[PDB]
Design a protein around this ligand. Sequence first.
Ligand code: KUH
Ligand code: CA
Length: 127
Amino acid sequence: SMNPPPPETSNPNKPKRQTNQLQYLLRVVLKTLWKHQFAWPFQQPVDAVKLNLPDYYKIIKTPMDMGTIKKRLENNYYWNAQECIQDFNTMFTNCYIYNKPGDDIVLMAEALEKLFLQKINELPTEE
Ligand SMILES: CCN(CC)S(=O)(=O)c1ccc(OC)c(NC(=O)c2[nH]c(C)c3c2CCCCC3=O)c1
Ligand SMILES: [Ca+2]
């Protein structure tokens, strides 16, 4: 089976804005996780074809990854910070749905999620 198309990262019909919270999410939150030693399984959509995981997209119907989130921020796809935070949470939830305690990928996701929650707990004041 094929991979699904990756999540949209631009929508020509959606209004666009820059905010301090969106700057923080891209330049502080995403950057911190992107550079982390455990970022690499989360920097792009799960390629279930190259990895031969034909049940991945039978189980995961809302895929999300930091490469998509990065592009969404870079393309001003998000209007509200909460849209972006939701995507990070979907990414982690998917990992815990598909995988089991003790899996390496779960240890990696838990570490990244701890760092994510630390950085979003310092999200700047809304305008
Ligand atoms: C395709 C080649 N590369 C990718 C550019 S790769 O970086 O060489 C590479 C190599 C092996 C790999 O896994 C064994 C992964 N896997 C992953 O990225 C990955 N990410 C997640 C979130 C998951 C997985 C698969 C394990 C369980 C399902 C899951 O939850 C990558
Ligand atoms: Ca699980």
